[PDB]
Amino acid sequence: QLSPEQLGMIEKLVAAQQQCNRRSFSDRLRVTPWPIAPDPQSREARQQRFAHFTELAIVSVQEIVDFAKQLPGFLQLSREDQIALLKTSAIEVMLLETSRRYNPGSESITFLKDFSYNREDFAKAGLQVEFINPIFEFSRAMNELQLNDAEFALLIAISIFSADRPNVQDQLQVERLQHTYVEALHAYVSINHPHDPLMFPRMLMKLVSLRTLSSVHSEQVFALRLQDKKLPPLLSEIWDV
Amino acid sequence: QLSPEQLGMIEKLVAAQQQCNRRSFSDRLRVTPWPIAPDPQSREARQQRFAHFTELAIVSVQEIVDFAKQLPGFLQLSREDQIALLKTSAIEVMLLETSRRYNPGSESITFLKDFSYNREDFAKAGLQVEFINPIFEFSRAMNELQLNDAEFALLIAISIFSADRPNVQDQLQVERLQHTYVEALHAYVSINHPHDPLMFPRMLMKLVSLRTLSSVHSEQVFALRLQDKKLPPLLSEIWDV
Amino acid sequence: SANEDMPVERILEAELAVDPVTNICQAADKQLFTLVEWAKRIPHFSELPLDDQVILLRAGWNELLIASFSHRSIAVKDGILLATGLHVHRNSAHSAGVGAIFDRVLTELVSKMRDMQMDKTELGCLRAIVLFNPDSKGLSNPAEVEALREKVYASLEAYCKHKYPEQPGRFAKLLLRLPALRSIGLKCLEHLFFFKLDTFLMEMLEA
Amino acid sequence: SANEDMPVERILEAELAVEPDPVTNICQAADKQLFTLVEWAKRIPHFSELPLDDQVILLRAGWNELLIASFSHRSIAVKDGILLATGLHVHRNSAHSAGVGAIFDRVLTELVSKMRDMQMDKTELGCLRAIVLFNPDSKGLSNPAEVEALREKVYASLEAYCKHKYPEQPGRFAKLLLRLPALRSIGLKCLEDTFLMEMLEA
Ligand SMILES: O=C(O)Cn1ccc2c(OCCCN(Cc3cccc(C(F)(F)F)c3Cl)CC(c3ccccc3)c3ccccc3)cccc21
Ligand SMILES: O=C(O)Cn1ccc2c(OCCCN(Cc3cccc(C(F)(F)F)c3Cl)CC(c3ccccc3)c3ccccc3)cccc21
Ligand SMILES: CC1=C(/C=C/C(C)=C\C=C\C(C)=C\C(=O)O)C(C)(C)CCC1
Ligand SMILES: CC1=C(/C=C/C(C)=C\C=C\C(C)=C\C(=O)O)C(C)(C)CCC1
């Protein structure tokens, strides 16, 4: 079963996501606008789409940091461990949040309510198909799961508390923290999907997929260097290094 | 015009190929037959198709060694260099000889006049699309070049006499030997394609494509290990280790 | 009925049926042959189209071998025991340039397997999970592979509830070794160049 | 006109515009030079007229051979070693100790030494790199035919250039081209008995 303690914790997580995200929404004008330029061979237009996308990403990372800070146990880690956890889980959480915003009907992804994009939009910014396609496939697949706010929030917490990240010092404590969310998610899905006990394993296996997607992402990062399309300081720090 | 020596050397290369090939042909009846079995899921039928193909490759390798021994200067190299050149050039010559046997109309390849196969036939033997497709594309492109017998023979010798193969000791001599054929080839284009000089660089650049194809082959060789599809002793010697 | 659809007994039978860097590569070379032997003994694998079987093995070979030698090395001190009886120690590893990844196998795989006493049956099931990966390209029918993977989830959980009744989270603990195995597998595959190739985050955390 | 279709003067200017453990340092040097690729390519005649997407595809496929060729030529003076873009020298001894002596030596003998020996000039280096760049065989090109056309224009321009600049070396064009198979095998590498003897004795 789920204890009141556990139901409270889940509520806190979900409320934190809502809080963090409302802060993102009102930051939305900081993002370089999407160009209306009519010419697919315009290099300036391309750069501006890339500026727009990388700036959206920065908002995402900001939201992810704000969220982690509210996870019980996170701020009790050394700063080195907080940084080791966030640096490598950012792309994974960003992927989960993205799948959350995938529309199967138009096959598009919508950020901050007003910015909707399909595969061709992402390619018009210079992103390669072997980055785009797997992410759309991940999104569709996640979309199929039909997870609710509680289940995303826990899966996000489980992803963040991954002790095998490079440079984690206190692995014991990170696993102990992760185990809380794992146990909670398990009780949650057995209670809320009583006729689908496979939902639990399906979800944990998404953590495996995120590893592949993280490697795909790193290959896109490199590909960007080849075009000399430079990442913003924050993104460069967490990914170029 | 071509010097008497270049003409004699070319006649010799062409004669050597015709003679070596007539011997191969005398062995066509010895080859394990292509399977008759109707069952795409039959492992036994797949293995038999693989056996047929590996047996053909041996015939090809036999011809290549036989032709190499006719190359002026080849037998004057050490046995070690002879072996170094043959082990690594074998796949390239096999590809060149396969490209001469490509039928643009049926998009098929025919060995020994009687054994014709399309892309699907090769897949039916368990070969991978990453291997099959580049070879068909190379074959199609070579076919379009419309080289004659002298031009193939020269390119084969040039490929064989590549000083940069692994384990080549007398590199300077191998280069000096290759130089004789390259010059002959250039003379041959100047005389026999007087209004199409681009034929020369086009032919030489095929030597580059062959390096990539060789890598593609090496990858297919590994994939065979994954399926424990054993190569016969000769083929294993030159490609496994 | 979960076990009947994917007998952990067959999966066990499948497992029982089968430079320091140079040593390791020779060890992998040796075991490559075992892969089809093992896979054919995994329930229903042989019923997939032949092309699909090749694809799954081609996709999972490294994680499959890594998992195998990790569980084999549970007895070793600071290294691994290759399929060729040879030992590779941490030191030898670091001196050859592959210290980080070697260390990662030791902590995330070997020791975790030791600590929880992962059994051969559990190992076998995890490998079947690795094997039945529906996401690889070119699969004739992915749904079918996905279906079999899920039969392994069901069968393994059942196995863990019955064999380790007073460890309710052991199943989850087994699956949670897979993310690490995937990351390690990818590292071991990445080629030379990429293999060998702070302030703003601290700022945000501190704000 | 061969030159007018693909001017070597421009190719030279492209090259000139982008002048300035061992394995890690070699990698860091490569990383430093990545940004030079679009800067160099945009000055190769007609490259900029290709679809943006094709441009990306050519650079992604060619990057490692393009860089290897550049440092090789830069290393022509250095004895038994290479000169990295970071100014570091890597000697072959240090390369063998680091366990990449085979590939390193291959670079010295097939590329650096051959460039030094024939006195490959910068125009010729640029043209060979242009040939590497305009590779119509990479997957995903919107129009391979156009890329192939450009490559042949380098063939004609480069050959014309060799006949005029080195009239007493009729083999020179072919000689430059014959470096490309070695470059391709090296570039591929950087990205990763009894029965024969008996056949030879028959
Ligand atoms: O929308 C909200 O409510 C909150 N929010 C605001 C921005 C926001 C967000 O930013 C998206 C920026 C778009 N993304 C930009 C981006 C993200 C990560 C790395 C890079 C790269 F490295 F520069 F390539 C980029 Cl350009 C691309 C997006 C994607 C989706 C589908 C196909 C291709 C690319 C993506 C998403 C997740 C991981 C990797 C790639 C992701 C998730 C939630 C977000
Ligand atoms: O026909 C003649 O007169 C002479 N002759 C007889 C056999 C013969 C010949 O044998 C071909 C056997 C078929 N081939 C067998 C083979 C060749 C090389 C490596 C392997 C492998 F390693 F086992 F994979 C195989 Cl099975 C495959 C063939 C091919 C063609 C198109 C798509 C995929 C594969 C091939 C050919 C050359 C290089 C690589 C692959 C090739 C060329 C001339 C020949
Ligand atoms: C782990 C590891 C590596 C290779 C792992 C691979 C590819 C599997 C080995 C198979 C064995 C060793 C099987 C066995 O003995 O049973 C590399 C080369 C990167 C170096 C050291 C870290
Ligand atoms: C050749 C070589 C390698 C890769 C070289 C590549 C692909 C990049 C070189 C760019 C440089 C060195 C640029 C410069 O300094 O101008 C590896 C890593 C396999 C190590 C052995 C030597």
PDB file of N, CA and C in Angstrom, chain B residues 145 151 185-205, chain D residues 2 152 155-157 159-160 163 173 177:
ATOM      1  N   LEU B 145      30.985   3.007 -65.664  1.00  0.00           N
ATOM      2  CA  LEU B 145      32.284   3.408 -66.195  1.00  0.00           C
ATOM      3  C   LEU B 145      32.581   2.716 -67.515  1.00  0.00           C
ATOM      4  N   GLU B 151      41.626  -2.325 -68.956  1.00  0.00           N
ATOM      5  CA  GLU B 151      41.473  -1.347 -67.889  1.00  0.00           C
ATOM      6  C   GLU B 151      41.215  -1.999 -66.521  1.00  0.00           C
ATOM      7  N   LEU B 185      48.414   2.695 -67.336  1.00  0.00           N
ATOM      8  CA  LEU B 185      46.991   3.005 -67.317  1.00  0.00           C
ATOM      9  C   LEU B 185      46.711   4.416 -67.815  1.00  0.00           C
ATOM     10  N   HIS B 186      47.574   5.351 -67.439  1.00  0.00           N
ATOM     11  CA  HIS B 186      47.410   6.738 -67.836  1.00  0.00           C
ATOM     12  C   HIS B 186      47.639   6.878 -69.349  1.00  0.00           C
ATOM     13  N   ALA B 187      48.718   6.281 -69.842  1.00  0.00           N
ATOM     14  CA  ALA B 187      48.944   6.192 -71.285  1.00  0.00           C
ATOM     15  C   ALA B 187      47.728   5.586 -71.985  1.00  0.00           C
ATOM     16  N   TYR B 188      47.226   4.470 -71.462  1.00  0.00           N
ATOM     17  CA  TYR B 188      46.076   3.794 -72.078  1.00  0.00           C
ATOM     18  C   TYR B 188      44.847   4.709 -72.192  1.00  0.00           C
ATOM     19  N   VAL B 189      44.558   5.487 -71.153  1.00  0.00           N
ATOM     20  CA  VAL B 189      43.425   6.416 -71.230  1.00  0.00           C
ATOM     21  C   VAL B 189      43.687   7.528 -72.239  1.00  0.00           C
ATOM     22  N   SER B 190      44.921   8.033 -72.262  1.00  0.00           N
ATOM     23  CA  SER B 190      45.280   9.119 -73.160  1.00  0.00           C
ATOM     24  C   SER B 190      45.113   8.696 -74.618  1.00  0.00           C
ATOM     25  N   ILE B 191      45.432   7.442 -74.907  1.00  0.00           N
ATOM     26  CA  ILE B 191      45.369   6.941 -76.274  1.00  0.00           C
ATOM     27  C   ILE B 191      43.969   6.479 -76.626  1.00  0.00           C
ATOM     28  N   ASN B 192      43.335   5.737 -75.722  1.00  0.00           N
ATOM     29  CA  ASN B 192      42.068   5.099 -76.044  1.00  0.00           C
ATOM     30  C   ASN B 192      40.820   5.843 -75.578  1.00  0.00           C
ATOM     31  N   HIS B 193      41.008   6.891 -74.779  1.00  0.00           N
ATOM     32  CA  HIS B 193      39.914   7.799 -74.427  1.00  0.00           C
ATOM     33  C   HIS B 193      40.383   9.228 -74.620  1.00  0.00           C
ATOM     34  N   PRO B 194      40.815   9.562 -75.838  1.00  0.00           N
ATOM     35  CA  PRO B 194      41.445  10.863 -76.092  1.00  0.00           C
ATOM     36  C   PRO B 194      40.506  12.046 -75.844  1.00  0.00           C
ATOM     37  N   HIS B 195      39.199  11.826 -75.877  1.00  0.00           N
ATOM     38  CA  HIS B 195      38.282  12.940 -75.637  1.00  0.00           C
ATOM     39  C   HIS B 195      37.546  12.795 -74.314  1.00  0.00           C
ATOM     40  N   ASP B 196      38.093  11.977 -73.422  1.00  0.00           N
ATOM     41  CA  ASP B 196      37.490  11.784 -72.113  1.00  0.00           C
ATOM     42  C   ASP B 196      38.569  11.553 -71.043  1.00  0.00           C
ATOM     43  N   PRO B 197      39.440  12.548 -70.799  1.00  0.00           N
ATOM     44  CA  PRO B 197      40.554  12.386 -69.841  1.00  0.00           C
ATOM     45  C   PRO B 197      40.109  12.056 -68.405  1.00  0.00           C
ATOM     46  N   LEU B 198      38.917  12.513 -68.019  1.00  0.00           N
ATOM     47  CA  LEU B 198      38.379  12.269 -66.688  1.00  0.00           C
ATOM     48  C   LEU B 198      38.272  10.781 -66.371  1.00  0.00           C
ATOM     49  N   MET B 199      38.379   9.941 -67.394  1.00  0.00           N
ATOM     50  CA  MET B 199      38.308   8.503 -67.182  1.00  0.00           C
ATOM     51  C   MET B 199      39.438   8.033 -66.259  1.00  0.00           C
ATOM     52  N   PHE B 200      40.588   8.693 -66.352  1.00  0.00           N
ATOM     53  CA  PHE B 200      41.746   8.322 -65.535  1.00  0.00           C
ATOM     54  C   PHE B 200      41.483   8.554 -64.042  1.00  0.00           C
ATOM     55  N   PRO B 201      41.257   9.819 -63.627  1.00  0.00           N
ATOM     56  CA  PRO B 201      40.970  10.028 -62.200  1.00  0.00           C
ATOM     57  C   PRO B 201      39.757   9.226 -61.725  1.00  0.00           C
ATOM     58  N   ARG B 202      38.743   9.076 -62.573  1.00  0.00           N
ATOM     59  CA  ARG B 202      37.575   8.286 -62.196  1.00  0.00           C
ATOM     60  C   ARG B 202      37.995   6.870 -61.826  1.00  0.00           C
ATOM     61  N   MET B 203      38.865   6.285 -62.635  1.00  0.00           N
ATOM     62  CA  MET B 203      39.322   4.930 -62.342  1.00  0.00           C
ATOM     63  C   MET B 203      40.142   4.885 -61.062  1.00  0.00           C
ATOM     64  N   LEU B 204      41.057   5.839 -60.890  1.00  0.00           N
ATOM     65  CA  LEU B 204      41.920   5.839 -59.718  1.00  0.00           C
ATOM     66  C   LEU B 204      41.114   6.011 -58.431  1.00  0.00           C
ATOM     67  N   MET B 205      40.063   6.817 -58.480  1.00  0.00           N
ATOM     68  CA  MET B 205      39.259   7.041 -57.282  1.00  0.00           C
ATOM     69  C   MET B 205      38.485   5.782 -56.864  1.00  0.00           C
TER      70      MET B 205
ATOM     71  N   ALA D   2      38.618  24.932 -67.196  1.00  0.00           N
ATOM     72  CA  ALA D   2      38.709  23.966 -66.103  1.00  0.00           C
ATOM     73  C   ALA D   2      39.040  24.709 -64.812  1.00  0.00           C
ATOM     74  N   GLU D 152      34.511  16.222 -60.024  1.00  0.00           N
ATOM     75  CA  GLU D 152      35.183  16.095 -61.308  1.00  0.00           C
ATOM     76  C   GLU D 152      35.779  17.424 -61.721  1.00  0.00           C
ATOM     77  N   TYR D 155      39.066  17.436 -60.231  1.00  0.00           N
ATOM     78  CA  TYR D 155      39.975  16.590 -61.015  1.00  0.00           C
ATOM     79  C   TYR D 155      40.582  17.394 -62.152  1.00  0.00           C
ATOM     80  N   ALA D 156      39.727  18.027 -62.955  1.00  0.00           N
ATOM     81  CA  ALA D 156      40.192  18.774 -64.138  1.00  0.00           C
ATOM     82  C   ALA D 156      41.036  20.003 -63.775  1.00  0.00           C
ATOM     83  N   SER D 157      40.575  20.770 -62.798  1.00  0.00           N
ATOM     84  CA  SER D 157      41.340  21.918 -62.340  1.00  0.00           C
ATOM     85  C   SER D 157      42.698  21.526 -61.756  1.00  0.00           C
ATOM     86  N   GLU D 159      44.416  18.704 -62.327  1.00  0.00           N
ATOM     87  CA  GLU D 159      45.301  18.179 -63.360  1.00  0.00           C
ATOM     88  C   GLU D 159      45.854  19.323 -64.204  1.00  0.00           C
ATOM     89  N   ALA D 160      44.979  20.232 -64.618  1.00  0.00           N
ATOM     90  CA  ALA D 160      45.428  21.399 -65.367  1.00  0.00           C
ATOM     91  C   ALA D 160      46.525  22.120 -64.596  1.00  0.00           C
ATOM     92  N   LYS D 163      49.968  20.169 -64.745  1.00  0.00           N
ATOM     93  CA  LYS D 163      50.621  20.237 -66.054  1.00  0.00           C
ATOM     94  C   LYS D 163      51.269  21.596 -66.279  1.00  0.00           C
ATOM     95  N   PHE D 173      49.978  14.551 -61.210  1.00  0.00           N
ATOM     96  CA  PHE D 173      48.549  14.395 -60.958  1.00  0.00           C
ATOM     97  C   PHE D 173      48.203  13.025 -60.353  1.00  0.00           C
ATOM     98  N   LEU D 177      46.741  11.828 -56.510  1.00  0.00           N
ATOM     99  CA  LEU D 177      45.543  11.016 -56.341  1.00  0.00           C
ATOM    100  C   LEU D 177      45.844   9.727 -55.575  1.00  0.00           C
TER     101      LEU D 177
END
